[PDB]
């Protein structure tokens, strides 16, 4: 059905939004969890840098994904058909009669026309 087309489509759009945005949420969230220092071995401090790296990079990544979905939604708003034919240039209506003179006279060229007659 045409219904589930656009519906499941837009649902994929919002679901993707849930994806990238929740990604930004949790990844920005747990960096705060990474802040702990005391009570942990210095070698155990080493991973935390890579952790923060993956979180932040996941964030800007998900942002880029949001740019993607946004451009998508742009296309969906804009993929709609033009309401009608749209204005361009209809300026200056052509002569009816110079056309007739070209037709007739250039076809009447070298002819002994006797007007119309009754």
């Amino acid at each position: 059905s045409f219904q589930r087309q656009l519906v499941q489509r837009t649902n994929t759009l919002n679901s993707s939004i849930d994806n990238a945005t929740l990604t930004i949420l949790s990844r920005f969230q747990d960096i705060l969890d990474i802040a702990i220092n005391e009570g942990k071995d210095k070698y155990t401090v080493a991973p935390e840098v890579y952790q923060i790296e993956c979180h932040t990079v996941s964030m800007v990544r998900a942002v880029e994904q949001l740019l993607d979905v946004s451009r998508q939604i742009k296309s969906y708003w804009l993929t709609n058909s033009l309401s009608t034919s749209f204005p361009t240039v209809d300026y200056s209506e052509p002569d009816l009669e110079k056309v007739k003179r070209t037709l007739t006279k250039l076809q009447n060229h070298l002819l002994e026309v006797s007007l119309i007659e009754p």
Partner: protein
């Protein structure tokens, strides 16, 4: 390189730890690199109970400073990424402003290929074969110039009357009415429209050249030979890449104009009204016969 070093070192971790755990369970030494089992027998390594062992201030100091450097690295990351993203906004906005010039000026918009861009129908006004422009970013242009399959830079339809020597006699060339819209992009949409127009028309015509020979009209297959009176050729083909002679330009007027106007009559005739009495009056197929009836007026004139 780096991953080779670290990861293979980790393979040595797995292998030697397997040497340690091979003292008991045998389902562990099995994963060691092939050279090792060929050499050193398993259960070789063994742990010892020993020492706290030692500790130093460098532990806590590096544990602090490295985290500082890490969070600051996150700051530099967020800020410089903010820069690149803002710049991406600055770039991307121009596209959709020019698309204000497109869609907000009411122009076709459709999904496209692997180009990721839009697939606008430049040929929105119609012709024969369908035409959609491949929108394409042009960094030099600030705007984003669009092109199609053309090898030709420009094109239209030259016409002229070859003599017995096939010297020039009558002559002319097609010209579109000039759009003067505020957006040059839309103007080029008009241009590519004009191109697909000349395409579909002359291609349809020479495609129709089929049975041109019934009243002497012929073909080099390049265009329309016109073996009529006094040995002449009204050559009519695609562009590369006194008062009575002005009136020859006027015979050329009826030709140039009324032929394209028959492209229009065939814009009506392609509507497939396909009316029966004409089907009695014609054979094949959808073909307009742009040519013969007019030159039949011409030869009836003769």
């Amino acid at each position: 390189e780096q991953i080779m070093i670290a990861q293979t070192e980790c393979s040595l971790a797995l292998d030697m730890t397997s040497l340690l755990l091979s003292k008991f369970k045998e389902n562990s030494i099995e994963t060691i690199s092939p050279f090792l089992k060929s050499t050193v027998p398993p259960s070789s390594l063994q742990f010892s109970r020993s020492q706290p062992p030692e500790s130093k201030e460098s532990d806590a100091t590096l544990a602090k400073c490295w985290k500082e450097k890490s969070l600051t690295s996150s700051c530099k990351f967020l800020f410089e990424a903010k820069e690149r993203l803002t710049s991406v906004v600055e770039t991307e906005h121009e596209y959709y402003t020019e698309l204000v010039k497109v869609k907000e000026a009411s122009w076709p918009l459709f999904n496209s290929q692997g180009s990721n861009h839009l697939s606008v129908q430049y040929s929105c006004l119609g012709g024969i074969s369908l035409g959609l422009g491949l929108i394409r970013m042009k960094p030099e242009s600030k705007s984003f110039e669009v092109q199609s399959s053309l090898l030709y830079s420009q094109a239209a339809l030259k016409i002229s009357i070859l003599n017995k020597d096939r010297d020039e006699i009558g002559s002319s060339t097609w010209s579109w009415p000039s759009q003067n819209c505020n957006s040059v992009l839309l103007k080029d949409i008009y241009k590519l429209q004009e191109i697909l127009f000349e395409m579909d028309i002359w291609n349809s015509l020479l495609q129709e050249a089929q049975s041109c020979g019934n009243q002497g009209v012929n073909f080099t297959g390049d265009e329309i030979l016109v073996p009529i009176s006094d040995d002449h050729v009204v050559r009519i083909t695609l562009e590369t890449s006194k008062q009575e002679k002005e009136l020859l330009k006027c015979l050329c007027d009826t030709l140039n104009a009324i032929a394209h106007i028959l492209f229009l009559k065939h814009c009506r005739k392609s509507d497939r009204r396909s009316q029966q009495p004409e089907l009695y009056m014609a054979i094949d197929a959808n073909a307009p016969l742009i040519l013969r009836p007019l030159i039949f007026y011409y030869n009836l004139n003769q």
